């Protein structure tokens with residue numbers, strides 16, 4: 001005690017603690033309220049979180065991410081086989097179970113998805129401990145509503161391995177609803193829609209709540225649609241631009257491309273608050289610095305189809321839950337990408353002006369709710 005709530009995300013993780021009737025989303029050593037779900041291995045050290053993602057551009061082969069896409073799955077799993085082709089790191093088969101293989105201290109090593117995730121959870125545990133100044137043992141860890149028993153078990157084992165006593169594994173959409181106090185009873189059932197657009201995945205969940213009891217009515221989405229896909233649309237736009245100004249194509253320079261992606265990710269976040277953003281990279285390619293800018297309008301155009309497409313899963317979820325737009329009582333935004341003004345307009349317009357629950361940072365909502373539940377179960 002106190003117990004913490006941890007959002008073990010696909011690309012970022014977040015930890016919160018409920019004290020004095022208030023949730024505190026804890027900042028890490030670098031002052032960030034969310035931490036990259038990354039782990040890197042080098043000749044001399046093991047890096048986790050910011051430290052790991054900061055050097056991803058120079059060490060692509062031994063920097064692991066997306067462990068959540070593998071957790072709880074068999075090697076023969078069709079999604080595992082498809083995802084592997086896209087990762088810069090190796091995934092090997094050990095007795096039918098996937099393991100990421102990397103070089104660490106000059107030796108080849110392999111880790112199960114739950115081991116990689118235990119490293120991320122340990123980082124989150126220490127982040128909470130640095131803030132509380134006390135040991136953290138109990139925690140509630142969240143998982144996507146569609147996770148099966150094996151995936152839930154593997155996520156719980158990741159916690160155990162990190163030295164945490166997992167009080168319970170709860171669904172991400174439910175945690176988000178708890179963050180907004182939507183689990184209080186005041187009569188009949190309420191239908192809540194969770195629009196979750198993160199860095200790597202997208203999901204829409206319709207829940208029915210009555211007497212503090214949740215019932216997942218339907219789920220929809222795209223496990224391969226996230227903010228990183230919006231960053232890629234920007235990267236290509238600028239590769240084309242750097243090519244025009246300098247008659248040089250940087251596409252085959254993996255590092256330059258990853259560094260440009262990072263600059264775009266940062267510009268994108270700025271565009272959610274401002275109408276323009278400046279990109280300034282020193283020595284991008286062959287010593288040439290890239291100093292340019294991009295407007296919100298242009299950013300939105302480069303992603304118009306992807307943004308608009310988020311509405312299909314919304315219609316399907318409603319259809320499968322056998323509900324009409326009008327029957328949705330609350331709409332909750334989760335995922336850092338839901339901070340994009342154009343996405344809020346699309347969703348809002350689709351729901352004919354209905355207001356969105358968005359006062360809690362979308363990329364913090366899951367951790368926020370998990371922290372509340374952790375205190376309750378504690």
Ligand SMILES: Nc1ncnc2c1ncn2[C@@H]1O[C@H](COP(=O)(O)OP(=O)(O)O)[C@@H](O)[C@H]1O
Nearest residue numbers: 009010011012198199200227228272336337363
């Ligand atoms: N202010 C923002 N505007 C636009 N996108 C954001 C903002 N903040 C975070 N994001 C995006 O949210 C994504 C990842 O964070 P979330 O917190 O969404 O992580 P996860 O993918 O693990 O659920 C990234 O694509 C990131 O760029």
Ligand SMILES: [Cl-]
Nearest residue numbers: 028029030049
């Ligand atoms: Cl840290």
Ligand SMILES: [Cl-]
Nearest residue numbers: 342345346349
């Ligand atoms: Cl629009």
Ligand SMILES: [K+]
Nearest residue numbers: 007009012013
């Ligand atoms: K997250």
Ligand SMILES: [K+]
Nearest residue numbers: 196197198201
């Ligand atoms: K998501």
Ligand SMILES: [Mg+2]
Nearest residue numbers: 009010198335
């Ligand atoms: Mg998420």
